[PDB]
Amino acid sequence: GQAAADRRTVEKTWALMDAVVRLCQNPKLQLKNSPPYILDILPDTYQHLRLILSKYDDNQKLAQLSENEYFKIYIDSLMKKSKRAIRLFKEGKERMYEEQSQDRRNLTKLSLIFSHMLAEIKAIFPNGQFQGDNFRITKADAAEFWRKFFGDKTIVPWKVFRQCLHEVHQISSGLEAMALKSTIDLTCNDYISVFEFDIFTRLFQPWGSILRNWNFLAVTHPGYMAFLTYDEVKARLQKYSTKPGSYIFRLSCTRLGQWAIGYVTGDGNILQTIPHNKPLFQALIDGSAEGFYLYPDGRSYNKVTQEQFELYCEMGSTFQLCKICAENDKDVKIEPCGHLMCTSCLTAWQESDGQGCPFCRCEIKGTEPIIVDPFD
Ligand SMILES: C[C@H]1CCCN(Cc2cc3c(c(C(F)(F)F)c2)CN(c2cccc([C@]4(c5nncn5C)C[C@@H](C)C4)c2)C3=O)C1
Ligand SMILES: [Zn+2]
Ligand SMILES: [Zn+2]
């Protein structure tokens, strides 16, 4: 059985979440209002988990929840990300109190992850009852791909998902697979939920050209600003208040799967809109043709490089993966150049007579084992 281990894991989960909440209540942080608001999200997550348990009343129901693969992965993921937030405060020290620090950007990355996890658990356990197996994917052709490979599965490991997706839409390099992972795996748990799949396929519709749409709208488009608040959109566009047709487009924590566009009017007002019954690309060319959307991020704009994939990857939390394969963790440092990669890729390059370091071609005088954090 798992009864007693399961009881222990839930209670450790709530202890670790309470620990993160207490560290975040430090007035020296000034994040009481800085949203996604970790001091709202973690209590809301606790609240939804209690609602789930409130519905899985007794020994027999609790045993069904125990056997739910999505629920097991969710609680494990919540424990790991809580431990990570604790470690960030222990290792970050007074840098947690500097707004611009890498340590504080990492707290923002964990806050976004917690926000996405709360949206996902509400989508999969609406009113605290499992509905993963009945989840209706928004885009018909995306929904057919998920039925075809995964049936009524709620969640699939990233490695399995990447292999099945590659059957229909070829993924090119390691840096593209890594960039794609960072886009679909919002919860950063190395799984793709049916919910995550729904969000990605809604944003980058149509399905027929989905990797080209994502490459063009997110990976290389100068107008794309990832997740922003309404206040951040005003702050960025204010710099172009005197150049009407200046625009950006962005994601919303509070409205997963939807785009929002901000633009500068003839009067220098900043307005925001959500594309109305059209995909983003159509909204952008239509608004372009009408004079609203002329200057992405305040400049004119007139098939993706490895460098462009690598720059996109830095926004996320995937620094532990080897850039060559995007499968194995970085476990070796090449010396003296200091480039990082997995042993497997190092071997394959020196196997096939590659000069020196795969990245910089320089003499390899030494290697040293290394553990790289996803947030490094
Ligand atoms: C909602 C508000 C909260 C306060 C911070 N601002 C600005 C900001 C945006 C992102 C981030 C930060 C910070 F954590 F690094 F600091 C800061 C991180 N971040 C982020 C984290 C993981 C993945 C991604 C996506 C992405 N977009 N371009 C590249 N990548 C990997 C968007 C997903 C569909 C894939 C983006 C922001 O959007 C956003
Ligand atoms: Zn590798
Ligand atoms: Zn090198």
Author numbering: 37 to 338, 354 to 427
Q: What did the article's authors report about this structure?
A:
The human Casitas B lymphoma-b (Cbl-b) protein is a member of the monomeric Cbl family of RING-type E3 ubiquitin ligases that are known to downregulate non-receptor and receptor protein tyrosine kinase (PTK) signaling by ubiquitinating and thereby targeting these kinases for proteasomal or lysosomal degradation. The Cbl family of E3 ligases share a highly conserved N-terminal region that contains the structural elements required for ubiquitin ligase activity, including a substrate recognition tyrosine kinase-binding domain (TKBD), a short linker helix region (LHR) and a RING finger domain. The LHR comprises an N-terminal loop (linker loop 1), a helix, and a C-terminal loop (linker loop 2) and contains a strictly conserved tyrosine residue (Y363 in Cbl-b) within the linker helix (LH) that is essential for regulating the Cbl proteins E3 ligase activity. Specifically, Cbl-b is a negative regulator of signaling pathways involving immune cell receptors, and it is particularly well-documented to play a central role in inhibiting effector T cell activation.
To further characterize the C7683 interaction with Cbl-b and understand its mechanism of action, we co-crystallized the N-terminal E3 ligase fragment of Cbl-b containing the TKBD, LHR and RING domains (residue range 38–427) in complex with C7683. To improve the crystal packing and obtain better diffracting crystals, we introduced three-point mutations on the surface of the Cbl-b TKB domain by mutating residues K51, K55, R325 to alanines (the mutant protein referred to here as 3mCbl-b), which yielded crystals diffracting to 1.8 Å resolution. These mutations are located far from the substrate binding site as well as the regulatory regions involved in Cbl-b activation. A well-resolved electron density map was observed for the entire C7683 molecule and Cbl-b protein, except for residues 339–353 in the flexible linker helix region (LHR). C7683 was nestled in an interface between the 3 TKBD subdomains and the LHR, consistent with our biophysical studies, which showed that the compound binding does not involve the RING domain. C7683 binds in an extended conformation, making extensive interactions with the residues of all three TKBD subdomains, the LHR and coordinating a nearby water molecule (HOH10). The methyl-substituted piperidine ring is nestled in a pocket between the 4H and the SH2 subdomains, where it makes hydrophobic and van der Waals contacts with C289, T265, P71 and P72, in addition to a hydrogen bonding interaction between its nitrogen atom (N31) and the side chain oxygen (OE1) of E268 in the SH2 domain. The Isoindolin-1-one ring is also located between 4H and SH2 subdomains, making hydrophobic interactions with atoms from T144, K145, L148 in the 4H domain and L264 in the SH2, and hydrogen bonds to the backbone nitrogen of F263 in the SH2 domain through its oxygen atom.
